């Protein structure tokens, strides 16, 4: 959803005929969410061995 | 919280000693008041 908001907001400030799917998409929010869940979270717990 | 207070105070001083319109000065004064309020007690009014 964060990436979708970014692409919607940036689709109206660039010039047409130079817009490609690779220039509208930002990966940083998705990787940030993944690495924030698998680290500092209350449900992904240190395993006891 | 000290850095925020100092930054707002410096911006307010420079804008006052420049001949700014009343709306902008009022906005800066409101923002300085909020910063000091957050310094003394954070979360009492509004959001933390």
């Amino acid at each position: 959803s964060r990436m979708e908001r970014v692409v919607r907001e940036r689709m109206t400030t660039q010039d047409v005929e130079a817009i490609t799917p690779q220039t509208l998409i930002n990966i940083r929010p998705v990787v940030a969410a993944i690495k924030e869940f698998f680290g500092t979270s209350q449900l992904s717990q240190f395993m006891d061995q | 919280l000290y850095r925020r207070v100092i930054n707002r105070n410096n911006r307010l001083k420079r804008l006052i000693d420049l001949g700014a319109p009343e709306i902008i000065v009022n906005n800066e004064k409101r923002m300085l008041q909020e910063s000091v309020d957050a310094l003394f007690d954070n979360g009492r009014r509004g959001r933390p």
């Binding site: 907001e9 940036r10 109206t12 400030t13 | 911006r11 804008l15 420049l18 700014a20 319109p21 709306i23 902008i24 906005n27």
Partner: protein, 110 residues
Amino acid sequence: KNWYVVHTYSGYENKVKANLEKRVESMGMQDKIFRVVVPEEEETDIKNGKKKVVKKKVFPGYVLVEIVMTDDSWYVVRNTPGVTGFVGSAGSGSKPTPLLPGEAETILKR
């Protein structure tokens, strides 16, 4: 038609001006907004002859913007990637207060 004020973050006045001038037409409203003016002046300084003219914005953080008032103009000039709000909102911000003729003229006359 009045002159209003907008509040950007810090250093993003010229990027808010650019994005707004682009979204004037790209979006679809060429008769609502009219003129965007980022107040600017000069600064006397030289380095043994070579000049610099520091970009001392006479109002760091604000961008006056001539605009009419509807319910789609507010939307476009409030979601621009950079603006923070409509400085002037004195009371639930239900109708931003416009800049006063005099002050607007003496700011533009610089």
